Coordinates of C-alpha atoms and ligand atoms in Angstrom, one line a residue:
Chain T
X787 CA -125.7 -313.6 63.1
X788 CA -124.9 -311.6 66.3
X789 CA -125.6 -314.0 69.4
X790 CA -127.1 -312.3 72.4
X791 CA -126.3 -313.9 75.8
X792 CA -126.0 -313.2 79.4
X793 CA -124.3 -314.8 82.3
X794 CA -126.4 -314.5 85.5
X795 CA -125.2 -315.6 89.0
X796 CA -124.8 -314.9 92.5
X797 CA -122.0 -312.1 94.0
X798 CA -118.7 -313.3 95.4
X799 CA -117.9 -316.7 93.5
X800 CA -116.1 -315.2 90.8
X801 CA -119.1 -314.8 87.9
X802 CA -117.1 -311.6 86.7
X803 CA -113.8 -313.3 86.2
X804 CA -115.5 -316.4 84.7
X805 CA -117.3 -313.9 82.7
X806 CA -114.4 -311.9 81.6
X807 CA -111.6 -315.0 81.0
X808 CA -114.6 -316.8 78.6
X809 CA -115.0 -313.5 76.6
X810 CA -110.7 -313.1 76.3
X811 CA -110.6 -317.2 75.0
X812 CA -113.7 -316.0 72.5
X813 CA -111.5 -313.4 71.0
X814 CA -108.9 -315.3 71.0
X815 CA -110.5 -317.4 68.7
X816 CA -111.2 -314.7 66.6
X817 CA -115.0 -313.5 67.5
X818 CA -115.6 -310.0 67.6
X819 CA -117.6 -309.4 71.6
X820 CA -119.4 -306.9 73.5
X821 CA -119.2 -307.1 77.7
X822 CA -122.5 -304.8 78.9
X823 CA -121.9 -305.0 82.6
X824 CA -125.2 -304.8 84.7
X825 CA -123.6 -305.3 87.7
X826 CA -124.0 -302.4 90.3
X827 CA -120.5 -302.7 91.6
X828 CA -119.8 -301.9 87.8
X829 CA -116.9 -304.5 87.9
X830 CA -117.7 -307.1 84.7
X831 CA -114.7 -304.8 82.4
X832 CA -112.0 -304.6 84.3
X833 CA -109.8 -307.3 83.5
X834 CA -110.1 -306.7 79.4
X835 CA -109.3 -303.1 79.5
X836 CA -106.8 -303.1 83.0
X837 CA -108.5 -300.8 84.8
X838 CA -109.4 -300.1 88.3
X839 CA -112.9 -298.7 87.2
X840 CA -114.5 -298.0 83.8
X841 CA -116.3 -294.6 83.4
X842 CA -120.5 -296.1 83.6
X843 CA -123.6 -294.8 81.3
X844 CA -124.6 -293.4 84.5
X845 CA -122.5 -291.7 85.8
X846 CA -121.1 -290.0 82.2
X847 CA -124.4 -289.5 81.7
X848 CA -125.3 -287.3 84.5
X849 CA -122.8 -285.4 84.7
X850 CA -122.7 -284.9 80.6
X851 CA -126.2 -283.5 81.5
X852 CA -127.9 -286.3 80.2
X853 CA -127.8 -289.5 78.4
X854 CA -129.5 -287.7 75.3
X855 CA -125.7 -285.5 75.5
X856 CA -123.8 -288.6 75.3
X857 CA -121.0 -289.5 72.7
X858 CA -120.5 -293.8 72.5
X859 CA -116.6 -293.2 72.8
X860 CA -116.9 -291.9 76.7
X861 CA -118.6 -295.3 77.2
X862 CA -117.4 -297.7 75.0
X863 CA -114.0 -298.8 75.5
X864 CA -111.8 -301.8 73.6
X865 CA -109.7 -303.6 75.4
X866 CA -107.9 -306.9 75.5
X867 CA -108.2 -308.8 71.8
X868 CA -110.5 -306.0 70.7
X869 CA -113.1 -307.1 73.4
X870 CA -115.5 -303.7 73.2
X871 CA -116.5 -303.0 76.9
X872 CA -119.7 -301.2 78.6
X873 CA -121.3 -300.2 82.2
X874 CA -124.1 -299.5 83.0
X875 CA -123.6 -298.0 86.2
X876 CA -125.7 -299.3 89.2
X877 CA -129.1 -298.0 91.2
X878 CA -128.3 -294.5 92.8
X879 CA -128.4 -295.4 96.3
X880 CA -131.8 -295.4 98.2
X881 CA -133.9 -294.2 94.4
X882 CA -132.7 -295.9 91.6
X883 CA -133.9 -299.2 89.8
X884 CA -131.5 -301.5 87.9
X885 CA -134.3 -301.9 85.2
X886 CA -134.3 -298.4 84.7
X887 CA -130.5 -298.3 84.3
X888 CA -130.3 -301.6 82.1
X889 CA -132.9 -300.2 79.7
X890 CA -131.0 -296.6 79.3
X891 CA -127.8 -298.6 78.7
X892 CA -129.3 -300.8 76.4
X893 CA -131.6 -297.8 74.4
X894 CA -128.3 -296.1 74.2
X895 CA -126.3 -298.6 72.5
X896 CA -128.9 -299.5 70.2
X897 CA -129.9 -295.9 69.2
X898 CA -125.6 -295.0 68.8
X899 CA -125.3 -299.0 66.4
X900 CA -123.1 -300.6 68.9
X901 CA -125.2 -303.3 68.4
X902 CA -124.5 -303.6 64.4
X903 CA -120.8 -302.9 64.4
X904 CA -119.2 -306.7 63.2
X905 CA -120.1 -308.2 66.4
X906 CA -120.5 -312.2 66.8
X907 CA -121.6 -312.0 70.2
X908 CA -122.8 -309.6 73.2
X909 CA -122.7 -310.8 77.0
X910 CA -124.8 -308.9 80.0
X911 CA -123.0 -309.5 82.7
X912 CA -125.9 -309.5 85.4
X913 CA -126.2 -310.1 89.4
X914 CA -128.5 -313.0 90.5
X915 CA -128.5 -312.2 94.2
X916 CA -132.3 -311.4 94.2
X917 CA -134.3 -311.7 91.0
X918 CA -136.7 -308.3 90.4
X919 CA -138.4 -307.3 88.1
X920 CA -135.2 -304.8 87.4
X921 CA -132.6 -307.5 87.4
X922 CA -134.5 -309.6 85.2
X923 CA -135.1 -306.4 82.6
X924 CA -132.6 -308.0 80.1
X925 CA -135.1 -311.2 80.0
X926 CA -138.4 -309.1 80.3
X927 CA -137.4 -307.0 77.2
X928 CA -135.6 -310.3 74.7
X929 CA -132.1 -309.0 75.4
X930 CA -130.1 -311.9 76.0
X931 CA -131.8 -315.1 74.4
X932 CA -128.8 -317.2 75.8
X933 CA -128.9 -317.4 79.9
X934 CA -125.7 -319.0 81.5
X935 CA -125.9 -319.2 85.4
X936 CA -122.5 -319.2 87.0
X937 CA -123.0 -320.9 90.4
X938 CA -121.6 -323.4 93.0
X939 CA -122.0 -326.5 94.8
X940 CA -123.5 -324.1 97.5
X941 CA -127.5 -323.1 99.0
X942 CA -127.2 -319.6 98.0
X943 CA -125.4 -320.3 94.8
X944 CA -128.0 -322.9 94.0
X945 CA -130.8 -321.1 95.2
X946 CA -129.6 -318.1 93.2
X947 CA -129.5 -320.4 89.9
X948 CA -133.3 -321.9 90.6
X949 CA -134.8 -318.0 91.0
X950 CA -132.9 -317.1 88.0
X951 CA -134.7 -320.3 86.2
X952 CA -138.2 -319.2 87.5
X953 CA -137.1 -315.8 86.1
X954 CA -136.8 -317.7 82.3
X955 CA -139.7 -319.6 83.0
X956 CA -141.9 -316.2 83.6
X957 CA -141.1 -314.7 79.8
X958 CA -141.5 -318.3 78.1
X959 CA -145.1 -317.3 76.2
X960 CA -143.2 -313.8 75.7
X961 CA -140.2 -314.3 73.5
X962 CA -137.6 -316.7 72.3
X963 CA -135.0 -316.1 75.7
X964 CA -133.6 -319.6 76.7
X965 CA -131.2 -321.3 79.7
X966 CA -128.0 -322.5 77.7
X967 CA -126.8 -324.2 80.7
X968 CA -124.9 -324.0 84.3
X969 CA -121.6 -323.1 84.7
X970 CA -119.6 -324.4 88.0
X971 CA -117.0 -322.2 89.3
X972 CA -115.1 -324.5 91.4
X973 CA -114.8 -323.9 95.8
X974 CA -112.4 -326.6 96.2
X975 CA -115.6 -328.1 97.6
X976 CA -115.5 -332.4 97.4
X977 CA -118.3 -333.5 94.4
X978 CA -119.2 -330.2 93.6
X979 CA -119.1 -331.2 90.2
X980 CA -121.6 -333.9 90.5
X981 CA -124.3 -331.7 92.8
X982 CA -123.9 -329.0 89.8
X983 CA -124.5 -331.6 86.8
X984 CA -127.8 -333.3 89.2
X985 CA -129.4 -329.6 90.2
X986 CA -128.8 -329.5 85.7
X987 CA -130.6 -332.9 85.3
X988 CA -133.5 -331.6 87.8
X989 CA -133.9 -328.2 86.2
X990 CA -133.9 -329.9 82.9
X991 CA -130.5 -328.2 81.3
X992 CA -127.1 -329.3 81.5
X993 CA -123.6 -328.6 83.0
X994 CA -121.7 -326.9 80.2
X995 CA -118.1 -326.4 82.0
X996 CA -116.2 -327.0 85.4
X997 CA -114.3 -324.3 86.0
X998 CA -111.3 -325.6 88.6
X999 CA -110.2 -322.9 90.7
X1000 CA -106.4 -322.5 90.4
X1001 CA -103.4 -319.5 92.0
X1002 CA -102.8 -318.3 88.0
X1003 CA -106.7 -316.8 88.0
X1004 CA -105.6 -314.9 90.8
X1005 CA -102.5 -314.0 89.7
X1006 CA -103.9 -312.8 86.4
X1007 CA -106.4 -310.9 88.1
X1008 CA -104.0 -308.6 90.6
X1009 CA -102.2 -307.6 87.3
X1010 CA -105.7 -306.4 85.8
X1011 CA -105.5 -308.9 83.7
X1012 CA -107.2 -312.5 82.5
X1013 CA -105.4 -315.6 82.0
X1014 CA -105.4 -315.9 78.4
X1015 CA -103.7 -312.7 78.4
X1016 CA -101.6 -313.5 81.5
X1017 CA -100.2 -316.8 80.7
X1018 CA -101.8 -318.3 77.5
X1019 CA -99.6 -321.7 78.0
X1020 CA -101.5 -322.5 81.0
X1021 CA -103.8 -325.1 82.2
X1022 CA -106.4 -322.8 83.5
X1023 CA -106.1 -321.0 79.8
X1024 CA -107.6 -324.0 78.0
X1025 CA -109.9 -324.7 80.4
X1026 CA -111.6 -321.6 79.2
X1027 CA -111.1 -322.0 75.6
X1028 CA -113.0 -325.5 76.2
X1029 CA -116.1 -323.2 78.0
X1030 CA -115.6 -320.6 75.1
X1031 CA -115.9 -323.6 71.8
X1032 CA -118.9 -325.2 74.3
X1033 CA -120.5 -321.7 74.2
X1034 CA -119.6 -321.5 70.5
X1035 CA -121.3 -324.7 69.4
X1036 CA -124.2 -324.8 72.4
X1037 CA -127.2 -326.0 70.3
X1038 CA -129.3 -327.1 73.9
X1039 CA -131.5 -323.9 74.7
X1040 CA -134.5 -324.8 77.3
X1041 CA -137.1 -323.4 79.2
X1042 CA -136.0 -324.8 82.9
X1043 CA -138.0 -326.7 85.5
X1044 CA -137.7 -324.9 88.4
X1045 CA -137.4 -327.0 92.1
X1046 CA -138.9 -326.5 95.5
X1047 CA -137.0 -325.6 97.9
X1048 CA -137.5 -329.2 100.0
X1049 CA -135.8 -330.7 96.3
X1050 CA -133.1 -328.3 96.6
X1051 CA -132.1 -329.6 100.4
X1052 CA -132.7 -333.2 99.3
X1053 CA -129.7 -332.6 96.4
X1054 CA -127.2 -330.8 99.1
X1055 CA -127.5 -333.5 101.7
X1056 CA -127.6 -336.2 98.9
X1057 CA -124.2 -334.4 97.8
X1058 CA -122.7 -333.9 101.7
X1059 CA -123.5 -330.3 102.1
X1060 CA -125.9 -330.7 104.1
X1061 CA -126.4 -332.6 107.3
X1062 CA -129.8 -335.0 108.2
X1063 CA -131.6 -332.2 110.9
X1064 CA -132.1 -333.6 114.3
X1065 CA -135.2 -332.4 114.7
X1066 CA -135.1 -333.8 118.4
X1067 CA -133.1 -330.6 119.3
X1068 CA -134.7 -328.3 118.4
X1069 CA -136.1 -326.0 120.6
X1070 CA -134.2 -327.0 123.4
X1071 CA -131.9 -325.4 126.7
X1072 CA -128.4 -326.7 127.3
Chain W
X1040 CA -142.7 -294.2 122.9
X1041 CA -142.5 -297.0 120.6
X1042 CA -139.1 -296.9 118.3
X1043 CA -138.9 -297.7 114.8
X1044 CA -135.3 -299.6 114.0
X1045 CA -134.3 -300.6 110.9
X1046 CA -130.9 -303.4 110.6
X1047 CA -129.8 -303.0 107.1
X1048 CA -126.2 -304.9 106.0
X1049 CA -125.3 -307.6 102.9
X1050 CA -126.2 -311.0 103.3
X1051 CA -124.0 -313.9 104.3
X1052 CA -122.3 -311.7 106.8
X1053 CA -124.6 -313.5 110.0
X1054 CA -126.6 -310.0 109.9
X1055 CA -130.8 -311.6 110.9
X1056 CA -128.7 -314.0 113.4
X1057 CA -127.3 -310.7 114.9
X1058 CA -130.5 -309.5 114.7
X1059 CA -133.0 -312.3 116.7
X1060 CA -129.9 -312.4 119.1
X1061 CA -130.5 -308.6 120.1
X1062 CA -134.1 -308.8 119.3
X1063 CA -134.1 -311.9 122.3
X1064 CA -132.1 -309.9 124.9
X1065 CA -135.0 -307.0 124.9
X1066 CA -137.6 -309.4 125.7
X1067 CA -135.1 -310.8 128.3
X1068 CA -135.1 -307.2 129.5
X1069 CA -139.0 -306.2 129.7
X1070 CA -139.3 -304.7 126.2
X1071 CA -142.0 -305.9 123.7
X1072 CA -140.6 -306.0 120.3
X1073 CA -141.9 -306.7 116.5
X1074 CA -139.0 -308.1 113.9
X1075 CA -140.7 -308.0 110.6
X1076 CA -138.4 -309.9 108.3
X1077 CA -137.8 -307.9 105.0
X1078 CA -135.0 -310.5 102.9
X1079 CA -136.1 -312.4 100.0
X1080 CA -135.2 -315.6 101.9
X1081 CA -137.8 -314.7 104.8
X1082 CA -135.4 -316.0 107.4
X1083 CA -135.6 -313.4 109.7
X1084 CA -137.6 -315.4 112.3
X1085 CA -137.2 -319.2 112.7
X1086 CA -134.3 -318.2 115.8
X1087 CA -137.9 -316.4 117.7
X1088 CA -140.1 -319.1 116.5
X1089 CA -138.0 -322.3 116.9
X1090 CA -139.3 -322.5 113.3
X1091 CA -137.8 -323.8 109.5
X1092 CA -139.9 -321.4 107.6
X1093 CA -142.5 -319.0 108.9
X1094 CA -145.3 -318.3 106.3
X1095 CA -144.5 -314.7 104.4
X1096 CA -147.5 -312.0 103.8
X1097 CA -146.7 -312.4 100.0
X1098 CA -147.4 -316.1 100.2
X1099 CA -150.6 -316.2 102.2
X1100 CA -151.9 -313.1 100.2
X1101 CA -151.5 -314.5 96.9
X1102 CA -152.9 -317.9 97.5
X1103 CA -155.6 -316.6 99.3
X1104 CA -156.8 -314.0 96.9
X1105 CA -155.5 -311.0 97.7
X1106 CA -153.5 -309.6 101.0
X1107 CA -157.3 -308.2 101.9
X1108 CA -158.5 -311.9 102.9
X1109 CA -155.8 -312.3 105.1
X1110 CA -156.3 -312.4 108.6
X1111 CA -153.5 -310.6 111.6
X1112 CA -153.0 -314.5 113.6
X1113 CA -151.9 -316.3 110.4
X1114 CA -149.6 -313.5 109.9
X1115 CA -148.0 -312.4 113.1
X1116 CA -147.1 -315.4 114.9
X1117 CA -145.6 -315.1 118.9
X1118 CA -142.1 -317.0 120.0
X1119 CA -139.2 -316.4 122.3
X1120 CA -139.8 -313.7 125.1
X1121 CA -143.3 -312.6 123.3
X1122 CA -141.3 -311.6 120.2
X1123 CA -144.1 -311.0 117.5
X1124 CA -142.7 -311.6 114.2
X1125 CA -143.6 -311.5 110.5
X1126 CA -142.1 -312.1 107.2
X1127 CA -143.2 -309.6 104.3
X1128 CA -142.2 -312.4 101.8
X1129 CA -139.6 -311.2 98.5
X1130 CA -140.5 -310.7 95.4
X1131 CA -141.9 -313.1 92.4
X1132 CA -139.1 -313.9 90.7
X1133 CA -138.2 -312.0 87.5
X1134 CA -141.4 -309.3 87.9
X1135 CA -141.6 -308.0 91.4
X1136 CA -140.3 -306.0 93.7
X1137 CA -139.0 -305.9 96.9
X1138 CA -140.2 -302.3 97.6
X1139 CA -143.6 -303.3 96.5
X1140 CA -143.7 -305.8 99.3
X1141 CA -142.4 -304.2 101.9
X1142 CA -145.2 -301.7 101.7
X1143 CA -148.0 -304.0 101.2
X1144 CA -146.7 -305.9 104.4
X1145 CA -146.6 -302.6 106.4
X1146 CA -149.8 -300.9 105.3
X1147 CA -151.4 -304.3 106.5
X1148 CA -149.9 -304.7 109.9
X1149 CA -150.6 -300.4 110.1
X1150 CA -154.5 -301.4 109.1
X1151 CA -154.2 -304.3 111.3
X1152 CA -153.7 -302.6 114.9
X1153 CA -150.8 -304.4 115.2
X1154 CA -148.3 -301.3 115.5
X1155 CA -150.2 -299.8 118.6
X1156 CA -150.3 -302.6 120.5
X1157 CA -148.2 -301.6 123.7
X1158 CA -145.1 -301.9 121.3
X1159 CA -141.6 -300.7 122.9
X1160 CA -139.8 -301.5 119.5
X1161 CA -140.3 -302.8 115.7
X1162 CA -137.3 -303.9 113.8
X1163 CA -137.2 -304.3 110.0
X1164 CA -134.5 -306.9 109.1
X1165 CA -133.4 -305.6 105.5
X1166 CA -130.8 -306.5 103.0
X1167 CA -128.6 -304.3 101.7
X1168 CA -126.3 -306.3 99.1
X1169 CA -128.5 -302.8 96.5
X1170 CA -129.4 -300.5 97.9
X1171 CA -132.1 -299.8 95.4
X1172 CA -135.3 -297.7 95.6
X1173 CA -137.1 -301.0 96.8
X1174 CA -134.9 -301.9 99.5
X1175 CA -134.8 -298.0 100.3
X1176 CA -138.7 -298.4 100.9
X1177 CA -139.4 -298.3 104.6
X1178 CA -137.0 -295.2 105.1
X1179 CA -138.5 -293.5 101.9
X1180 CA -141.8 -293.8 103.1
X1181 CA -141.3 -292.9 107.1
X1182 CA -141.4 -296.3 108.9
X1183 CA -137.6 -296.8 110.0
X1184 CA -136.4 -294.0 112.2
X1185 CA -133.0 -294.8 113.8
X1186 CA -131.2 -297.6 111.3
X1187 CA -127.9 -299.8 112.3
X1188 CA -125.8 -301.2 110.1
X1189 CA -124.2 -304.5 110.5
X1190 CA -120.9 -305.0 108.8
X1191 CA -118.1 -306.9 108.8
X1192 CA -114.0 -306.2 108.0
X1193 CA -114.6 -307.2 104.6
X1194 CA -114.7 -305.3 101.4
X1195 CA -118.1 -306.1 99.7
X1196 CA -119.8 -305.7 103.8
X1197 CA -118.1 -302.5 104.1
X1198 CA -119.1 -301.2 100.3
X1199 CA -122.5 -301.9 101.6
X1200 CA -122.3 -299.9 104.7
X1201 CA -121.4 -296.9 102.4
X1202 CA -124.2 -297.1 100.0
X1203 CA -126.6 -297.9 103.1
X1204 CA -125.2 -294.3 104.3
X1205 CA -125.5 -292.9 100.9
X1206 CA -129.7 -293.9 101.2
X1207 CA -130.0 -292.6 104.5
X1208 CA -128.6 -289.0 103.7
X1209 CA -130.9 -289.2 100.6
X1210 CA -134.4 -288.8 102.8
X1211 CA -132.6 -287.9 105.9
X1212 CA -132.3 -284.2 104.1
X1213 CA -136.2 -283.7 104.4
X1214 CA -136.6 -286.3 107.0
X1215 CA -136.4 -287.7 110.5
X1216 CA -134.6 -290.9 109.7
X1217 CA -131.6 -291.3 111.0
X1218 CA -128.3 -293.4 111.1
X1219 CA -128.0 -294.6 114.8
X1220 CA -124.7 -296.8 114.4
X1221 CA -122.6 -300.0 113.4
X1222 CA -122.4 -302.8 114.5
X1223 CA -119.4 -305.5 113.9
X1224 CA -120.3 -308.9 113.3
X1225 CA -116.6 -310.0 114.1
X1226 CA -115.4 -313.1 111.3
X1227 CA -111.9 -312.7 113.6
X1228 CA -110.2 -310.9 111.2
X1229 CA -107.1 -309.1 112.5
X1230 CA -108.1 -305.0 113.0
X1231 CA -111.5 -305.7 112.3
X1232 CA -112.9 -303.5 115.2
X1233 CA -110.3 -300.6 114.5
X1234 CA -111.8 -300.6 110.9
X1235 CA -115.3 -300.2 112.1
X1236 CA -114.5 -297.7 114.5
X1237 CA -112.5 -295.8 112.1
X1238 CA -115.4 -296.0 109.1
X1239 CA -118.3 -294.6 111.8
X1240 CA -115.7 -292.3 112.4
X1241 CA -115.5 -290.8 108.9
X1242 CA -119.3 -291.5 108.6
X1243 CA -120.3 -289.3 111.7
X1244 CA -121.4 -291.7 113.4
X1245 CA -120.4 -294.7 116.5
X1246 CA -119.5 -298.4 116.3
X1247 CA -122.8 -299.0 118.4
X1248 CA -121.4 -302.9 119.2
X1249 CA -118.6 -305.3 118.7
X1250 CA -120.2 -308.6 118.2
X1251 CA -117.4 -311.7 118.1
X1252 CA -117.2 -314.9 116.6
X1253 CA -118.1 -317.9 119.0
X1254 CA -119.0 -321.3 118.3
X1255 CA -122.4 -321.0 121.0
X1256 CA -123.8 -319.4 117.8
X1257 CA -123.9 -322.1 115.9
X1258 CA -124.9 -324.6 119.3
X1259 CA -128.1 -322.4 119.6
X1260 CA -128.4 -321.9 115.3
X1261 CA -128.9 -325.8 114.8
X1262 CA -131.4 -326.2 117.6
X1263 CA -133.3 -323.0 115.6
X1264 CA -132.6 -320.9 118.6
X1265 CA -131.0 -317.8 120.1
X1266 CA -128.0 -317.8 122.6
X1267 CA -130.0 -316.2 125.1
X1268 CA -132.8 -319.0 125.1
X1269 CA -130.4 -321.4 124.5
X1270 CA -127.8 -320.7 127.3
X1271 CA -128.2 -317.4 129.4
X1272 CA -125.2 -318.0 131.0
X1273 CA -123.0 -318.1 127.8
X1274 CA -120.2 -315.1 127.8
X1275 CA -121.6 -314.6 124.2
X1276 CA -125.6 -314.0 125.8
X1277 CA -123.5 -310.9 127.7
X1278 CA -122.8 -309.5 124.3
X1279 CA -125.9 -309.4 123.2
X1280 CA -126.8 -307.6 126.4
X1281 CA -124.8 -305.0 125.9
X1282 CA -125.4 -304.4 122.4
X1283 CA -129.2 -304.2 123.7
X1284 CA -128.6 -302.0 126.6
X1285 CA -126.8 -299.3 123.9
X1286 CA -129.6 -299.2 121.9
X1287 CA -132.0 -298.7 124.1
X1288 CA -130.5 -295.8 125.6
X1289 CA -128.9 -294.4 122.2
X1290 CA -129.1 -290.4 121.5
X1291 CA -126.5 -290.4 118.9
X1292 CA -129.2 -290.1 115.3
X1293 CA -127.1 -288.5 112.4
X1294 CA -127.1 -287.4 108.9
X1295 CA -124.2 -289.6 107.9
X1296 CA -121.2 -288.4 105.8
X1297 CA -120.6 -290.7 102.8
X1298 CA -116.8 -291.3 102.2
X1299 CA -115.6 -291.9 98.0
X1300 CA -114.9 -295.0 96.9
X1301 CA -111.1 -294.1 97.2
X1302 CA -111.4 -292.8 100.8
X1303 CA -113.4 -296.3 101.7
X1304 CA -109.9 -298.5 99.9
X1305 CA -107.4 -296.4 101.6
X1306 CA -109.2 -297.4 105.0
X1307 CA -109.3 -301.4 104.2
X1308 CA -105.7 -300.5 102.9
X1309 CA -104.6 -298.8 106.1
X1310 CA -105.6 -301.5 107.9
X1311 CA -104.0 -304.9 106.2
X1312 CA -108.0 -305.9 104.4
X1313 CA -106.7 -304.6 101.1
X1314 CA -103.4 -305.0 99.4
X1315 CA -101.1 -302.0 98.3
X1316 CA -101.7 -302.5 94.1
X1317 CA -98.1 -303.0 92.4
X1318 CA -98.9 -300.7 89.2
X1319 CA -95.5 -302.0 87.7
X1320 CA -97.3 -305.4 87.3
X1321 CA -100.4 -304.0 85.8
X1322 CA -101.5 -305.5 82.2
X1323 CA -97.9 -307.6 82.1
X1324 CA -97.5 -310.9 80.7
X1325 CA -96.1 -314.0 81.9
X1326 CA -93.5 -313.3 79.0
X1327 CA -92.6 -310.2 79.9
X1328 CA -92.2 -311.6 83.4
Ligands
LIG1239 S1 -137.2 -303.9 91.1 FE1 -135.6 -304.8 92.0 S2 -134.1 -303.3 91.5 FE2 -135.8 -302.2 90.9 S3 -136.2 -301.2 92.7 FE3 -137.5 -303.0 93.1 S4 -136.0 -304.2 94.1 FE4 -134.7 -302.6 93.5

């Protein structure tokens, strides 16, 4: 039956593409998806349907009067491989809640039977930057059952990952939602791969794929586009059908053990992130 | 007259370093100054305190009860150039928020005295990566007057200093809080303070500062410090002078004009940030070259 997962990270290391290029390889196999995008630059949809900016709940919503005015086709669109896509729309600046926005995405779809409609699987693609109460709405309310956590062999990346973990580790008495696993996307960054798969060990999960960073992603992405739809002869191309049949068979759902932040150091400079501090310095005139 | 200054701007763009840096060069220059931190991380203070982590009012309230059996001294600790600083703490995450904490932080120091105590300045450090009702919550509720916003010649910082301007002219309407300027935190990208001054520009308002990159930064960073403790004589202590001496005497307090999201790429396209988008190329395979 229909899978319900999310994919939670940090901005700017490519989540949304990750996102996106995992979905195309999971049609391409023949599953039937949904994209929600939670994301308040409202940018998780793009690269299925090869547009500069989907139409959001939001925004079609007030403007249609409101939601309780709104038809599913102004907000549901199919794209690439018959991948259905959805935003949200993010907080209206200086009121809003993301919560709020999540739950009237969510409430819609279920109410109009998006959720029923063939579907194998549905992925909120969610922001990780701080974890409230309102980005964490898709856990508080059994959502997405399946959490994967795009990060990188970065603090803030890492840091990002371990909040999101405390997040699942909040709802655990609550309902059945569960960390799949980390995802690495690749900084070109030496044993990034091996910080990822240790911070997995400590937080009691595992590293499910390494994506590599490589010029067709890029290439791909200025044309709109993914690279399974780009260039489905290429490398990068079967390294996200390897994520997408990982996904597919992932059995190893856990409630995380979340690390302290003097742990989280002790991995970075163990890794060659980070440097031993000097604490002779400190505090002191040239 | 004591001023209340809010620095709002996304993260990883150096924004709280900016911050102590300016913060440092007041007290240099007679003034007595609060920075109460307001990210999630709390790092808003270890360049005042010499410090790696300065204990957050969410923290101290939580293990000891409630924020009612906390004390002012274990809260608002002294460093650099009497500097008093405080970190409101972020929220428990996956249920709380930011907003929530911000207020609880600032009714306290309010109950506290510590707002009437021959003050020249307070200066909430606050991200803006969302600018969400929470984050919105000292200008919603009256306790940030003038706000600056640090950006950067980058797309995501400069998206940020749109929606920033979006919150101010939400509560600036029926309000006294104002937009007072940008400032540049230089990452040498070419036109970088052309694009600044152009966006204040269409925004109604000033590039307040140009702040550049220099390596003394990162000298005084390691060592937990500001520039200005760390080497007064350093070009880049000068800067932060400046960017001090404008503030101080700054008139310039604006309802700001947000720009659309097309308006904002035609700027970062005008000058050489964004690329011209080939619409030829658009949704074309490999195989159809
Ligand atoms: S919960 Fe999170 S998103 Fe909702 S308002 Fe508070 S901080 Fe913003």
């Amino acid at each position: 039956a229909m899978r319900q997962c999310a994919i939670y990270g940090k901005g700017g290391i490519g989540k949304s593409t990750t996102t996106q290029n995992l979905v195309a390889a999971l049609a391409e196999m023949g599953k039937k998806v949904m994209i929600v995008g939670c994301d308040p630059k409202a940018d998780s949809t793009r690269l299925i349907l090869h547009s500069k900016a989907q139409n959001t709940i939001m925004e079609m919503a007030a403007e249609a009067g409101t939601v309780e005015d709104l038809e599913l086709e102004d907000v549901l669109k199919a794209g690439y491989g018959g991948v259905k896509c959805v935003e949200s729309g993010g907080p209206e600046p200086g009121v809003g809640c993301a919560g709020r926005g999540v739950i009237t995405a969510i409430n819609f779809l279920e109410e109009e039977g998006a959720y029923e409609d063939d579907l194998d699987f549905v992925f909120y693609d969610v922001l990780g930057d701080v974890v409230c109460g309102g980005f964490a709405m898709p856990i508080r309310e059994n959502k997405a059952q399946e959490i994967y956590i795009v990060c990188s062999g970065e603090m803030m990346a890492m840091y990002a990952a371990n909040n999101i973990s405390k997040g699942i580790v909040k709802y655990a008495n609550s309902g059945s939602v569960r960390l799949g696993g980390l995802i690495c996307n690749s900084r070109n960054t030496d044993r990034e791969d091996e910080l990822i798969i240790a911070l997995a060990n400590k937080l009691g999960t595992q590293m499910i794929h390494f994506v590599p960073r490589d010029n067709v992603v890029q290439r791909a992405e200025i044309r709109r586009m993914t690279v399974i739809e780009y260039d489905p002869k290429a490398k990068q191309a079967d390294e996200y059908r390897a994520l997408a049949r990982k996904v597919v068979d992932n059995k190893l759902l856990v409630i995380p053990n979340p690390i302290t932040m003097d742990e989280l150091e002790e991995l970075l400079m163990e890794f060659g992130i980070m440097e031993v501090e000097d604490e002779s310095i400190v505090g002191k005139t040239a």
